[PDB]
Ligand binder design. Sequence first.
Ligand code: MG
Lengths: 129, 83, 189, 94, 149
Amino acid sequence: VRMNVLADALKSINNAEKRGKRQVLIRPCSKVIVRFLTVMMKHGYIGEFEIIDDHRAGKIVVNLTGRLNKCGVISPRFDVQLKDLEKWQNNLLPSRQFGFIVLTTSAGIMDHEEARRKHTGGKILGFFF
Amino acid sequence: PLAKDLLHPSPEEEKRKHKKKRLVQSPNSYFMDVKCPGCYKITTVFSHAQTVVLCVGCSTVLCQPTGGKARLTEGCSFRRKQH
Amino acid sequence: SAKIVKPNGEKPDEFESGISQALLELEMNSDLKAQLRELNITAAKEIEVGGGRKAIIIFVPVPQLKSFQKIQVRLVRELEKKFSGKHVVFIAQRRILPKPTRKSRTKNKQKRPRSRTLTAVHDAILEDLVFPSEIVGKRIRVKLDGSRLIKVHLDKAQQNNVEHKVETFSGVYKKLTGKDVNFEFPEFQ
Amino acid sequence: SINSRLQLVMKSGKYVLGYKQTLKMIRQGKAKLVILANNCPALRKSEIEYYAMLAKTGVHHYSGNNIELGTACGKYYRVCTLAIIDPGDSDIIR
Amino acid sequence: GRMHAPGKGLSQSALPYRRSVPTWLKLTSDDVKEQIYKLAKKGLTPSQIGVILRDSHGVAQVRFVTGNKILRILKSKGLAPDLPEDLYHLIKKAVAVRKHLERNRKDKDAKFRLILIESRIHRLARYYKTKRVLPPNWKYESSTASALV
Ligand SMILES: [Mg+2]
């Protein structure tokens, strides 16, 4: 069933941007969704998303742009110990020149660059690039 | 295709969508404030009835229930408009 | 004269007196009476808005709110006309408990209901502001900066009362809560 | 059927199970539905059915067993006859 | 797609944004709690009350009119049933399947619909043991079941 609500959503926003779809809604919604999408907003990977408030769960509607090649999700949230952060961002991103492993540490949800500035580890969620 | 303004969907194309599939989940049902010929009394019948709606008076019976909406009996009116 | 319909620890005369005196003035009045004896405010503030024409926000205990709603339209009409050049609106004085971190712990402390949590409060604050309009649905923007702008769909029944106000409400929580919101007057189902 | 109604009378109302009490409650006149089963042997049938007719009490020959009655009474056990004194909300009485 | 069947259907109820009462309604939190009250008294299930109250009567949802949901109104006054209505509907069903299986020992079909039904019982039961509405002891037994209805 709905186990992981990212994988759910991120499939459907990778899986639109292939078709070139202009915008998409994501059915279940969550806090973690919002908080990881707002990360994608900063590096440009999407445009402004506007969350509907069906009284229950939430829907979102994501303005897409052309720019997202793929976003995916590492499904079990392994615990990343900062020394490993490299070994991951080697084998999970296309280059050292862009690509963003979104993860979730002590000091909020954020990309790997921002966990490195603050010097924290934590749990991998996914990656967009 | 390539541009469907999902957030501002024109009123028609939610009514041709299954209740839960809509942008916001709303029902496709209603109450009706019902006259009936004998008594002037108005009962507050819910379209999709399930049970037989009897008159606040007594004798007459308003709504046989069927699959979807309720079958009003013979010659009796109703009033949607609200909310 | 002032102090008899505002009891909560908070006196500070200025408006609270003048506004409660206008409540007391509305008791010298047929039918708008007796139902007003039971009622009672707590505090009140003057707050300006972007346009210039400031609004008076009135707080209420909370259990009385559901009785203030019976009077509100008749109330506002009269004291808005009295205490002129200004908009008036009622809110319930909700508590907002802090979140129990492990830091701010669980030494004892009775629960902390959802009613009394954070996001319930500013949401019930919405239902207190636009009493006559009533909410039909919210959307919630995220601009490319990250600034979260809400959009509140209100109904239509008693739009006429509320349509002129709007940017008072926009001004209102931005003092109370700290959130920026504009109101839209839409289709039906 | 008189499983559902009877069930409700047990919980809420008043009763007497079996015999002798039931017949006393007819004697007294304070019992106004005697539920026989089938399997009440046909003398007792006719002598309760008579002995109630005279009081002016409704009788029921429940399509039962002695047992399918016990089970229906929420009793866990053999009840041939029973008498209902007072129902709850149950419209067992007509 | 359902617990125990292929059919992956969806047909459910669906409420609006709005929750605030809809102004037809007279009654008030009391007169609804006066009426739930009299129906449960007469002998109806918490579902069945919710029903009567909407079609004939007026209340979209009790929950919205009063503070709490039907079960709590019965339970806080002590008209609530012994076990959950939701469960003895399965138990009553089981005992009905039992019966005709006991006359017709060929019905292979009835010998899921029993096994399934038994399993939808046990399954239910063992939260009612962790949510603690049932005491940690009660158990099915075929024999003692027919009585329990
Ligand atoms: Mg299975």
